[PDB]
Amino acid sequence: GNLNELALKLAGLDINKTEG
Amino acid sequence: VPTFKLVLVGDGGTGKTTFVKRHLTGEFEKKYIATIGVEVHPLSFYTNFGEIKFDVWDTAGLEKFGGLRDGYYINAQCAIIMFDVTSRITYKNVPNWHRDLVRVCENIPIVLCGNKVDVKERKVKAKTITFHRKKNLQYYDISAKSNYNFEKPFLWLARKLAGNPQLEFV
Amino acid sequence: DLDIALLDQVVSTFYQGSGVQQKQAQEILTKFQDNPDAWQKADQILQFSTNPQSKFIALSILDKLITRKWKLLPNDHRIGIRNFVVGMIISMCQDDEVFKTQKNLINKSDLTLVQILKQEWPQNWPEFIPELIGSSSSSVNVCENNMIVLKLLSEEVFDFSAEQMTQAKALHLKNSMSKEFEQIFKLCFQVLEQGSSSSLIVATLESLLRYLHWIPYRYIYETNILELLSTKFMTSPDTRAITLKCLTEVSNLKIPQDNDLIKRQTVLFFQNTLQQIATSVMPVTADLKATYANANGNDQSFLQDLAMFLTTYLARNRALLESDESLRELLLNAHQYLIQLSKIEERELFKTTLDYWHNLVADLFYEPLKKHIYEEICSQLRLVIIENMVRPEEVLVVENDEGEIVREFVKESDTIQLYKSEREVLVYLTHLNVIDTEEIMISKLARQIDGSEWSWHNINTLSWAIGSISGTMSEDTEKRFVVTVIKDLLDLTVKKRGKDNKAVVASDIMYVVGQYPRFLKAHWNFLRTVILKLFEFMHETHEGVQDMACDTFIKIVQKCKYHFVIQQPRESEPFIQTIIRDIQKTTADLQPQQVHTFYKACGIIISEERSVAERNRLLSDLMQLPNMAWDTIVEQSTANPTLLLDSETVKIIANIIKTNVAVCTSMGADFYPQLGHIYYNMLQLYRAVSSMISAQVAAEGLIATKTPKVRGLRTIKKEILKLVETYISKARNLDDVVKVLVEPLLNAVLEDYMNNVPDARDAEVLNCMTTVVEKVGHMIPQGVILILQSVFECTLDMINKDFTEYPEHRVEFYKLLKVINEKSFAAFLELPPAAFKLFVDAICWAFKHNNRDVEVNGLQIALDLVKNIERMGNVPFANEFHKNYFFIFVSETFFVLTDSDHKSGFSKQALLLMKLISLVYDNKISVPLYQGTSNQVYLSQYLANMLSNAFPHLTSEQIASFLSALTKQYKDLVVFKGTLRDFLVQIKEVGGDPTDYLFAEDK
Ligand SMILES: Nc1nc2c(ncn2[C@@H]2O[C@H](COP(=O)(O)OP(=O)(O)OP(=O)(O)O)[C@@H](O)[C@H]2O)c(=O)[nH]1
Ligand SMILES: [Mg+2]
């Protein structure tokens, strides 16, 4: 198995976006 | 605005005076200067429903300085019993302080406080502290030195005496 | 001095006034009741005063007389005081307003009667109990008050007699109560079955509660009292709480174990009780969480007491209820009430139920055939625990003595310990049903996402719950579960509006991943993304995020360090190389403390590097920035200490040293080369700052110690001591510590310590030396002598004027003496005799402290010293020691034993005294101790004379009998301590019985 999807999503974690 | 007599009891050196003095002036005293008999200190907290006032009767924990002893407890409307989690004997004496207290004041809100939880070699381990259960005391770990749960004993008492669970200090 | 009216006024000014006048009244009152003649003022106060507070004080005065001097009194006065107290109690009972409103005063009078009973009963008051029983028919008030009297007698005899009475006296009073209890029980049972008056019945049940601590179970099981407690007194509101307390103690009785009848009785009272609670109080469906928040009447205490009863009974008796299928519904209803109680927002009540749930879920795990009975209970329990998870990590923010703000994690707190208990229960429950657990936590998370249960508290709490069950699900289920959770949280973060909300959820993602190191280690790519994300967060200025980022970085590397030092498939280099290279950019926006944490994290990783050349290389690279700064500033600043008047330079230097400290803390032994790189210039720096600090304190005094300038300098000084202490404490190569580190260290710190003025000497110097002696003291006998010479007398002088000044120095001094005495006693043998006397003096001075942190070490040193001397054979230092000091230690030990306020030292005081006595009674001292009489007789004589001088009210018979016991019991610690406790009781009073010291043999 792998975690490639999850790693890419986590790399998008952004507390300064405004997609609220 | 009413005033509530609060008696503060427990073994010598456990932190009673230094807890109160920090509450009054913001400063923390490092020296141990044993209390002789009692000192009464008015202590006010401002709340979201107004001012609350305690007359804090800070009693001596050393036998040789005990003074009037349980005679300090007459009229008390609440109490804190303090011990020191770095010293097992001070927890061993908590039932003796409680006994002398409630023989005078049958039905008052009491908080039990284990102080000095900042210190690295804790001797009175948390699992060990159960005396308050059968006596219906509140319990908190505190640290007068490091500001841990510093207002909680007064907050719980204030709520109890004002009959107001929503009361908050401000 | 003060007649009745004026005493009344003083009391009323003390209790009802304030300020300065209240304090002046206090002093009058305190002196008055300490007056040995005060007790003649007292009856008069009791006869004539109009003030219940005056009468309380008069009773306290009489208690002092009763407790201490009663047997000095003529038999006339005794019977007079006794008749007076009895009649006064009866008047107060027969006066309605007083009986209503002066209960503390009647309770005090009752306790005074009990003090007399302790002296007089039953041997000189055999009719007391039948008289009391008789007078209870005379009045309902008197009867009620009689229950208070019997309750206090029970407490004073059974619960509180240990240490307040001799062992012999306590046995006599317990046997006396035991013999007369049949009649007290008769009265008690009669009132419970007939009485109306709730206040009388409540008093009766309060006394029963105390009797249950000691009475034989047959009073409970062979009468009808269980029926009354479980039916009658549960139905009436005012008796509910006290009846549950009684039934809690019934459940703890010593009862036969192989007896069907007793088992049925035990089931029946619980059956009755739970039925009565459902009929008369509240059904299992009631929302106790809301009832408890309401707080009507005494309901909170009742519910607390119900939790106690249920958990007490069930922890002991659950298998009994499981053993018959007709009991199933009782079993389950009892558990369902517990589930409801567990939802109440009151932490101490929650912990009480949690202790029981722990017992239960362990038992289901280890006997899973039972598991089907509790499925529904367990399901609701997962939810309760999840919803009440507390935070597993807590940080204290404090200002130190140099004014810096310092974050420290709390260890072993009540909160932390509750987290651990919660986790253990939830681990068991997870294995009991992993699908249910998973569903509960996923749907809980869905209700964060749909907003219905959203809040910072709820998402944090759910995160702590989820993070607590790592290693429960099996690796593959865990993988899927964690993927699902993390994705749900990543969407939740995107969905929430506002930086505050997104920071909370982001911090919880980082929390959950830190708690699943198997999941992290399985996929390097994911781990590496986590770390790079944390590094992004180290630039985020939003409150708390940088600290969260640094804390998670070090937490993760503690667990996954290996993955940073190897070269991973598909990467050109070990990730530690990458971290080190971008370290300046990565940390640029961190505060200094955070930067130090980062460097500490790096050192964890580097210690994992197995090859020494490569590890040293990594260390060298890691330290490039602080070394560059060091190499450009420090030597220069030390050759012209006028460059350190720049507070900005002092700041930069402090932070360099703290960077070293941080790296050393994690690398320990592996830090050697970096320490070596800065060592000699670091020690020149120490001297230059210590000189400047002392110079200014000398000229300006104490207040110079609070200045921004002196604080910055003291920081450098203390960090240098911290770095050396930290390294030496973890060193593995002790040869280098001794050959390279110690000698420069001692030359730099010791003479400077001695020459500094008292207010510039740092206690941390003593701490550092303690670590040096602990670690390599066996290898540096000459260094240890230097340590003593430099710090011994000058520190003793700071702390021997009073007990209160230089608190840190007191504590560190006796710690250092203790370790020197354990590890290099030879240094004490080299002292000149006058300095050795000072050492003995210092040990005795520690004994006299009301300060547990000093006292313990003083006592331990004395014991260790005596063993050290005892291990030297028949040799003249030994024999000289004994002739010079044996008796100094005997009387000093006795002096603190008999003092009011050195009770924490009791155990070691006893041991020391046993050891001293053995030295003589085991004929281990080869010389005579006096200037062919044996040392045994000389010792007994010394002791009789010492004791009759310190305690002149003791009789010769009391002293002969105590000493005869002590000298026979000194191999048996427990018995020996019992005799000492008896002695401490007898010295507080006149007329003790000398036959008390025969208690051990009479047995
Ligand atoms: N480490 C630590 N020390 C504390 C804390 N609170 C108080 N102390 C120290 O413990 C000692 C407590 O002294 P006091 O408060 O005078 O003692 P007390 O309980 O009033 O004693 P008596 O008046 O003798 O009954 C002082 O040396 C304090 O500095 C704490 O939270 N942590
Ligand atoms: Mg005090």
Cβ(C487)–Cβ(A11) below 8 Å: no
Query: What is the least distance, in Å, from the CA of B118 to any CA of chain C?
Result: 7
Rounded Cα gap, residues C406 and C397, in angstroms: 6
CATH number belonging to domain B1-170 = 3.40.50.300
> What's the gap in Å between B36 CA and the centre of ligand 2?
8
Rounded Cα gap, residues C504 and C545, in angstroms: 9
Query: What's the helix, strand, coil split of chain B in %, to 5?
Result: 30, 30, 40
Kindly report the number of other CB atoms within 10 A of residue C863's CB atom. Answer: 18
Closest partner residue to A4 among C499, C525, C532, by Cβ?
A: C525
C47 touching chain B per CB within 8 A: no
CA distances from C666 to C136, C408, C564, C597, C730 (A): 74, 16, 15, 10, 10
Q: What is the DSSP letter of B36?
A: -
Compute the residue count for chain C.
1003
Rounded Cα gap, residues C990 and C999, in angstroms: 19
Cβ(C372)–Cβ(C433) below 8 Å: no
Residues forming beta bridges with residue B39, ordered by sequence position: B58
Residue C22: both structure tokens together: 């209240």
Residues in CB range of C93: below 8 A, 6 or more apart: C99, C106, C139, C141, C142, C144, C145
C786-799: b or e for each residue (b if 16 or more CB lie within 10 Å)?
A: bbbbbbbeebbebb
User: Which residue is closest in CA terms to ligand 1's atom 8?
Assistant: B15
Rounded Cα gap, residues B80 and B58, in angstroms: 10
Angle, to 10 degrees, between the axis of helix C763-776 and the axis of helix C708-730? 10
Residues in CB range of A20: below 8 A, 6 or more apart: C495, C496, C497, C498
Which residue type does C132 have?
L
Kindly report the number of other CB atoms within 10 A of residue C951's CB atom. Answer: 15
Residue B149: both structure tokens together: 């749960």
Residue C732: both structure tokens together: 């593995």
C558-574: b or e for each residue (b if 16 or more CB lie within 10 Å)?
A: ebbbebbbeeeeeeeeb
- By C-alpha distance, the chain A residue nearest C500 is A15
From the list C4, C60, C8, C7, the residue with the least C-alpha distance to C33 is C60
Q: Helix (H, G, I), strand (E, B), or coil: what is residue C157?
A: helix
Contact A13 C533 (CB under 8 A): yes
Contact C529 A2 (CB under 8 A): no
Cβ(C129)–Cβ(C183) below 8 Å: yes
- Number of helical H runs and strand E runs in chain C: 52, 2
Domain ranges of chain C: 1-1003
Residues of chain B with Cβ-Cβ distance to C396 below 8 Å are 118, 143, 146-148
Cβ(C469)–Cβ(C515) below 8 Å: no
Compute the count of residue pairs across chains A and C with CB atoms less than 8 Å apart.
Answer: 53
Q: Give the mutation candidate from B88, B99, B103, B108 for the C interface (greatest C CB count, under 10 A).
A: B103
> What's the gap in Å between C756 CA and the centre of ligand 1?
29
Residue C975: both structure tokens together: 């018995």
Rounded Cα gap, residues C526 and C537, in angstroms: 17
Residues of chain A with Cβ-Cβ distance to C526 below 8 Å are 3, 6-7, 10
Residue C143: both structure tokens together: 């009867």
Closest partner residue to C413 among B38, B69, B126, by Cβ?
A: B126
**Which method resolved this structure?**
X-ray
Rounded Cα gap, residues C154 and C152, in angstroms: 5
Contact C486 A2 (CB under 8 A): no
Q: Give the mutation candidate from C852, C907, C988 for the B interface (greatest B CB count, under 10 A).
A: C852
What does R_g of chain A's alpha carbons equal in angstroms?
A: 11
Peptide bond preceding C122 in cis form (omega within 30 of 0)? yes
Residue C278: both structure tokens together: 């459902």
Residue written as tokens 């699908």? C435
Contacting C residues, span 437-456, partner chain B, CB-CB under 8 Å: none
Cβ(B144)–Cβ(B22) below 8 Å: yes
Rounded Cα gap, residues C883 and C871, in angstroms: 16
Residues of chain A with Cβ-Cβ distance to C530 below 8 Å are 10
Half-sphere exposure in the Cβ direction for A9 (13 Å, CA): 18
Following DSSP, what letter does each residue of C804-865 receive, concatenated?
SS-HHHHHHHHHHHHHHHHH-THHHHHS-HHHHHHHHHHHHHHHT-S-HHHHHHHHHHHHHH
User: Which residue is closest in CA terms to ligand 1's atom 17?
Assistant: B13
From the list C771, C710, C729, the residue with the least C-alpha distance to C746 is C771
Which residue type does C96 have?
D
Cβ(C741)–Cβ(C724) below 8 Å: yes
CA distances from B71 to C2, C41, C60, C833, C910 (A): 19, 17, 8, 52, 34
C12 touching chain B per CB within 8 A: no
Residue B66: both structure tokens together: 């005990």
Rounded Cα gap, residues C626 and C644, in angstroms: 18
Contact C523 A7 (CB under 8 A): yes
**Dihedral angle computed from the Cα positions of residues C741, C772, C597 and C509, in that order, rounded to the nearest 10 degrees:** 140
Please, what is the Cα angle at C350 between C280 and B128, to 5 degrees? 120
Cβ(C944)–Cβ(C925) below 8 Å: no
Preceding residues of all breaks in chain B (C to N beyond 2.5 angstroms)?
none
Residue written as tokens 């050349």? C613
Contact C506 A13 (CB under 8 A): yes
- By C-alpha distance, the chain C residue nearest A18 is C497
Q: For C399-544, where are the alpha helices, taking DSSP H only? A: 414-432, 434-449, 456-467, 475-495, 499-514, 517-522, 524-537
Taken in order C761, C762, C765, C767, is the CA torsion positive or negative? positive
Kindly report the number of other CB atoms within 10 A of residue C151's CB atom. Answer: 22
Q: Helix (H, G, I), strand (E, B), or coil: what is residue B42?
A: strand
From the list C552, C616, C626, the residue with the least C-alpha distance to C583 is C626
C13-25: b or e for each residue (b if 16 or more CB lie within 10 Å)?
A: bbbeeeeeebeeb
Ligand closest to the CA atom of residue B34: 1
From the list B26, B18, B56, A11, the residue with the least C-alpha distance to C493 is A11
Query: What is the least distance, in Å, from the CA of C500 to any CA of chain A?
Result: 8
Residue written as tokens 């993927």? C483
What does R_g of chain C's alpha carbons equal in angstroms?
A: 36
Residue C544: both structure tokens together: 């708390």
Contacts 24+ apart (CB under 8 A), C755-760: C755/C694, C756/C690, C756/C693, C756/C694, C757/C694, C757/C697, C757/C698, C758/C798, C758/C806, C759/C697, C759/C701, C759/C702, C759/C705, C760/C690, C760/C693, C760/C694, C760/C697, C760/C698, C760/C705
CA distances from C510 to C151, C549, C550 (A): 58, 8, 11
Please, what is the Cα angle at C740 between C735 and C742, to 5 degrees? 90
> What's the gap in Å between B16 CA and the centre of ligand 1?
6
Q: Which residues line ligand 1 (CB under 6 A)?
A: B 12-18, 29-35, 60-62, 115-116, 118-119, 143-146
With an 8 Å CB cutoff and a minimum of 3 pairs, decide whether chains B and A touch.
no
From the list C612, C620, C524, the residue with the least C-alpha distance to C569 is C524
Residues of chain C with Cβ-Cβ distance to B33 below 8 Å are 804
From the list C918, C920, C912, C734, the residue with the least C-alpha distance to C823 is C734
Partner chains of C (3+ C-beta pairs under 8 Å): A, B
> What's the gap in Å between C830 CA and the centre of ligand 2?
43
Cβ(C357)–Cβ(C342) below 8 Å: yes
User: Which residue is closest in CA terms to ligand 1's atom 28?
Assistant: B30
Residue written as tokens 């240098």? C720
Contact B145 C398 (CB under 8 A): yes
Please, what is the Cα angle at B52 between B47 and B58, to 5 degrees? 125
Q: Are strands B38-47 and C395-399 parallel, antiparallel or unpaired?
A: unpaired
Query: What is the least distance, in Å, from the CA of B40 to any CA of chain C?
Result: 8
Residue written as tokens 């800070």? B58
Cβ(C824)–Cβ(C784) below 8 Å: yes
Domain ranges of chain B: 1-170
Ligand closest to the CA atom of residue B32: 1
| Greatest CA separation for chain C | 102
Residue written as tokens 């105390």? C210
Rounded Cα gap, residues C994 and C953, in angstroms: 13
C104 touching chain B per CB within 8 A: yes
Residues in CB range of C132: below 8 A, 6 or more apart: C146, C149, C150
Burial class (CB in 10 A: 0-12, 13-18, 19+), C366: exposed
> What's the gap in Å between C886 CA and the centre of ligand 1?
35
Closest partner residue to C412 among B122, B148, B165, by Cβ?
A: B122
> What's the gap in Å between B12 CA and the centre of ligand 2?
7
Q: Helix (H, G, I), strand (E, B), or coil: what is residue C875?
A: coil
Rounded Cα gap, residues C598 and C592, in angstroms: 10
Rounded Cα gap, residues B78 and B154, in angstroms: 10
Contacts 24+ apart (CB under 8 A), B90-93: B90/B10, B90/B11, B90/B13, B90/B14, B90/B124, B91/B124, B91/B128, B91/B129, B91/B131, B93/B10, B93/B11
CA distances from C295 to B51, B164, B165, B168, C755 (A): 23, 10, 9, 18, 65
Closest partner residue to C529 among A7, A15, A19, by Cβ?
A: A7
> What's the gap in Å between B31 CA and the centre of ligand 1?
8
CA distances from C425 to C165, C320, C385, C459 (A): 44, 23, 8, 21
Rounded Cα gap, residues C762 and C744, in angstroms: 19
Query: What is the least distance, in Å, from the CA of C186 to any CA of chain B?
Result: 26
Which residue type does C400 have?
N
Following DSSP, what letter does each residue of C276-345 receive, concatenated?
HHHHHT--TTS-HHHHHHHT-TTHHHHHHHHHHHHHHHHHHHHHHHHS-GGGHHHHHHHHHHHHHHTTSS
Closest partner residue to A2 among C486, C498, C523, by Cβ?
A: C523
From the list C785, C793, C782, C846, the residue with the least C-alpha distance to C815 is C846
Residue C259: both structure tokens together: 């007896």
Taken in order C821, C824, C829, C830, is the CA torsion positive or negative? negative
Residues of chain C with Cβ-Cβ distance to B102 below 8 Å are none
Contacting A residues, span 1-20, partner chain C, CB-CB under 8 Å: 1-4, 6-7, 9-17, 19-20
Task: For C396, list phi and psi in degrees, rounded to 5.
Answer: -95, 130
